[PDB]
Amino acid sequence: SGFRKMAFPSGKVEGCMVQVTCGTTTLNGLWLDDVVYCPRHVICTSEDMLNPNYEDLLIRKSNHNFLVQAGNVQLRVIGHSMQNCVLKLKVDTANPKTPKYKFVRIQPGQTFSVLACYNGSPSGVYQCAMRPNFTIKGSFLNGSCGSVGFNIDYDCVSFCYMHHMELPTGVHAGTDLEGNFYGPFVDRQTAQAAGTDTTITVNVLAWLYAAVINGDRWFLNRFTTTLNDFNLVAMKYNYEPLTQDHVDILGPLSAQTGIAVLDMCASLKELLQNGMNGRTILGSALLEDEFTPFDVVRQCSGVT
Amino acid sequence: SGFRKMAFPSGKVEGCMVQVTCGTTTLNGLWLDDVVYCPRHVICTSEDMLNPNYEDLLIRKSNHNFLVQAGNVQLRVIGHSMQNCVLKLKVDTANPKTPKYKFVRIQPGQTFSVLACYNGSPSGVYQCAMRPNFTIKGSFLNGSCGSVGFNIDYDCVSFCYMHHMELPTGVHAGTDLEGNFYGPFVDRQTAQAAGTDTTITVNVLAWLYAAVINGDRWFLNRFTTTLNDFNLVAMKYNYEPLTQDHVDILGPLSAQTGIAVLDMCASLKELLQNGMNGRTILGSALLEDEFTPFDVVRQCSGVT
Ligand SMILES: *[C@@H](Cl)C(=O)N(c1ccc(-c2ccccc2)cc1)[C@@H](C(=O)N[C@@H](C)c1ccccc1)c1cccnc1
Ligand SMILES: *[C@H](Cl)C(=O)N(c1ccc(-c2ccccc2)cc1)[C@@H](C(=O)N[C@@H](C)c1ccccc1)c1cccnc1
């Protein structure tokens, strides 16, 4: 019993964090095989934040301008390239602790674990969702850039996010491990705002199924609903539209609870139209949307 | 910016988790140097849950009745003893991945990280508080027993919790690493209640300081209060009484924000007396009490 914001174990990712310094700037890199990945803004200075020409700036740099440090050991940069918004530093030593890994581009509403790092040293781990507007609501200070987001399938670490910057709201933006930013953001000091963020409907439904599995059954109602009718109520409360793919994805929890998806949807509508009257579901006074149906199945089936 | 329930990196603890089997029962053990620690209930069977005489049960066991498995390696048990509610299995090989560690008995209201394990394999990591009533509100399934709670100071792992059981309300109970239970609980199937759990007042104040630091300031009011005055209101809402030591402990956040502690108390008082009016602080619709002043400082200063 119980339901917590649970991260994956971070050990495999800890062994891959290094410190990358270029001139004055210090930020975290990810060391896999004989390559270190980090944010390309590491090569900027203050004069160049409003509109850097990275191509130009990168040309003014040589291999020896990049100091890479893993623990106390200094690694030798024998190459450097830029892939979209990431710098790839080629080093003469493959990481002995390189896990089985993939790079994946995740979809909005999916979750991952963040290993928040400073000076190449892991500081903490937490679970995050990629918001519909392609930001993440993380917890990151100055120096956190290069910190990575990941999911672990058995032995394979799937890297899906690299932290690049904080926005005016205080939300965070970043890229996949191929340097492509999630959303419409750019690595420069300019006016950037995220779009309207919606609530991940399928995630709230999964969390409600988790509540039932944990005995919090009050919100359950005597009414059912239809996709069309629910989706009309959803648009009003800035909830993402629910698809049959979402209905199909929730099947495992429906079968374990004996509660059909559309009956769960009808209970959400009432919580949306009538509020929670001051009660709490799974310790929260608001509807949570950062848990996927998989996250819920995992935290209720005990996957290791 | 941002504020999340953040766990410590779990890598150091991952390398210490093993699988302990005695007869039919499998659970998790902690392998440090040449000793494996696990819950003594591993030696029990179904007929013996209501009132086991462990001394007696243990006498029916020899070294070879204990299977310890770390990954695929089977370790050889060369000794066994019982310390309070933990079994200590002596093995012939010291753990090569043993971190610098201590065993600590933590105070109520303190926090720690849990590495939830099944079959000796890490599954997930999350942050918990030891409740005033000496339970924890965790997320553990069958097979979780022997999973541990810890804090990491630099390279030093302080083990403070081993999971032993789930109580009727589905909160969890366990021991320190000397096998002394937190609270009045015993390792048998009897009826055990936690009694009244209060809110950790000092942690709520810390969290409020976290909010201010993150720009959430609506709840700040034009009042101050006194310790006595505040505590009279705290007792009414089952908040732990605030001491001068708690006041001293909040000094960093106080100095950082330039908001005096007693002024923050007066703001808590109104929130308690008036509720939050359906507003939120740091993405929550209720007052959070599972972050310590240290957790807050750490998350708002960048410790690794
Ligand atoms: C831990 Cl691997 C587990 O699956 N248990 C559990 C704990 C303790 C015992 C036990 C105690 C004394 C003698 C023999 C065996 C057995 C199983 C789960 C659990 O605590 N069930 C509770 C209801 C229980 C308490 C006391 C005795 C028996 C059962 C458990 C389940 C979920 C999360 N954590 C632990
Ligand atoms: C990352 Cl180590 C960091 O401390 N930054 C940061 C990000 C990006 C840049 C940058 C961008 C383009 C050219 C040069 C440098 C510098 C610093 C923090 C940050 O994002 N500050 C924001 C306001 C910023 C955005 C864009 C440009 C400059 C600054 C930061 C702070 C807190 C959490 N994460 C990141």
> Which residues of B fall within a CB distance of 8 Å from A283?
137
Test A11 with B7 for CB contact under 8 angstroms: no
Residue in A1, A15, A117 nearest the CB of B166: A1
For B203-229, the DSSP string reads HHHHHHHHHHHTT--TT--S----HHH
| Nearest CA among B158, B162, B146 for reference residue B103 | B158
| Residue B264: strand, helix, or coil | helix
CA dist A131 and A290 (Å) reads: 9
For residue B124, the surrounding DSSP H or E stretch is strand B121-129
Residue A135 tokens read as: 């930001």
- Which residue matches tokens 């609530």? A199
For residue B157, the surrounding DSSP H or E stretch is strand B156-166
Pocket probe mutation, ligand 1, options B19, B145, B162, B186, max atoms within 8 Å of Cβ: B145
CA of A125 to the centre of ligand 1 (A): 28
Residue B109 tokens read as: 């209201």
CA angle B103, B111, A111 (to 5 degrees): 115
- The resolution of the experimental structure, rounded to one decimal in Å, is 2.1
Burial of B289 by CB count in 10 Å (0-12 exposed, 13-18 middle, 19+ buried)?
buried
User: Ligand 1 pocket, B166 CB below 6 A?
Assistant: yes
- Dihedral angle sign, alpha carbons of residues B203, A214, A275, A132: positive
| B201-213 vs B261-274: helix crossing angle, rounded to 10 | 100
Q: Whose CA is nearest to atom 3 of ligand 1?
A: B142
| Residue B111: strand, helix, or coil | strand
Q: For residues B160 and B151, is the Cβ–Cβ distance under 8 A? A: yes
Residue in B1, B10, B285 nearest the CB of A9: B10
CA of A165 to the centre of ligand 2 (A): 5
Test A6 with B126 for CB contact under 8 angstroms: yes
| Residue B180: strand, helix, or coil | coil
Nearest atom, ligand 1, residue B142 CA: 4
User: Which residue in chain B has the smallest CA separation from A122?
Assistant: B304
Amino acid making up residue B174? G
Amino acid making up residue A90? K
- How would you write chain A as a 3-class SS string? CCCCCCECCCHHHHCCEEEEEECCEEEEEEEECCEEEEEHHHHCCHHHCCCCCHHHHHHCCCHHHEEEEECCEEECEEEEEEECCEEEEEECCCCCCCCCEEECCCCCCCEEEEEEEECCEEEEEEEEECCCCCCECCCCCCCCCCCEEEEEECCEEEEEEEEEEECCCCCEEEECCCCCECCCCCCCCCCCCCCCCCECHHHHHHHHHHHHHCCCCCCCCCCCCCHHHHHHHHHHCCECCCCHHHHHHCHHHHHHHCCCHHHHHHHHHHHHHHCCCCCCECCECCCCCCCCHHHHHHHHHCCC
Residue in B7, B171, B276 nearest the CB of A7: B7
* Most A-contacting residue of B1, B167, B287 (CB-CB within 10 A), to test interface: B1
- A153 Cβ contact list (under 8 Å, min separation 6): none
| C-alpha distance from residue A285 to each of A268, B278, B283 (Å) | 14, 9, 10
> Which residues of A fall within a CB distance of 8 Å from B174?
none
| Nearest CA among A227, A300, A238 for reference residue A265 | A227
Rg of chain B (C-alpha set): 22
CA dist B173 and B161 (Å) reads: 9
Burial of B207 by CB count in 10 Å (0-12 exposed, 13-18 middle, 19+ buried)?
buried
Q: Whose CA is nearest to atom 29 of ligand 2?
A: A189
CA dist B260 and B86 (Å) reads: 45
User: Ligand 1 pocket, B189 CB below 6 A?
Assistant: yes
CA of B42 to the centre of ligand 1 (A): 10
User: Which residue in chain B has the smallest CA separation from A11?
Assistant: B11
> Which residues of A fall within a CB distance of 8 Å from B301?
141
- Calculate the CA dihedral of residues A129, A134, A139, A143 and round it to 10 degrees: 130
Residue A110 CB coordination number (10 Å): 17
- Active-site entry in A16, A41, A128, A246: A41
Test B4 with A8 for CB contact under 8 angstroms: no
User: Ligand 2 pocket, A38 CB below 6 A?
Assistant: no
User: Ligand 2 pocket, A141 CB below 6 A?
Assistant: yes
Q: Does the beta carbon of A168 lie under 8 angstroms from any beta carbon of chain B? A: no
Test B124 with A166 for CB contact under 8 angstroms: no
| Residue B24: strand, helix, or coil | coil
- B204 Cβ contact list (under 8 Å, min separation 6): B239, B268, B287, B288, B289
CA dist B195 and B192 (Å) reads: 9
For B40-107, the DSSP string reads GGGG--GGGSSS--HHHHHHT--GGGEEEEETTEEEPEEEEEEETTEEEEEESS--TTPPEEEE--PP
Specify whether B156 is catalytic: no
Q: For residues B118 and B166, is the Cβ–Cβ distance under 8 A? A: no
Q: Which domains does chain A have, with CATH numbers?
A: 1-14+100-197 (2.40.10.10), 15-99 (2.40.10.10), 198-301 (1.10.1840.10)
CA of B172 to the centre of ligand 1 (A): 10
Minimum distance, in Å, between the CA of residue B10 and any CA atom of chain A: 6
CA dist B211 and B85 (Å) reads: 41
- Dihedral angle sign, alpha carbons of residues B264, B268, B270, B271: positive
| A261-274 vs A201-213: helix crossing angle, rounded to 10 | 100
Phi then psi for B266, rounded to 5 degrees? -60, -35
For residue B126, the surrounding DSSP H or E stretch is strand B121-129
Pocket probe mutation, ligand 2, options A165, A167, A169, A189, max atoms within 8 Å of Cβ: A165
CA dist B179 and B150 (Å) reads: 15
| Nearest CA among A27, A197, A40, A37 for reference residue A129 | A197
> Which residues of A fall within a CB distance of 8 Å from B119?
304
B77 CB-side CA count, 13 A = 22
User: Ligand 1 pocket, B185 CB below 6 A?
Assistant: no
Specify whether B41 is catalytic: yes
How far is C-alpha A222 from the chain's CA centre? Answer: 36
Q: Does the beta carbon of A141 lie under 8 angstroms from any beta carbon of chain B? A: yes
CA dist B226 and B232 (Å) reads: 10
For residue B271, the surrounding DSSP H or E stretch is helix B261-274
| B261-274 vs B227-236: helix crossing angle, rounded to 10 | 30
- A42 Cβ contact list (under 8 Å, min separation 6): A20, A21, A22, A25, A27, A87, A145, A146
| Residue B168: strand, helix, or coil | coil
Q: For residues A147 and A115, is the Cβ–Cβ distance under 8 A? A: yes
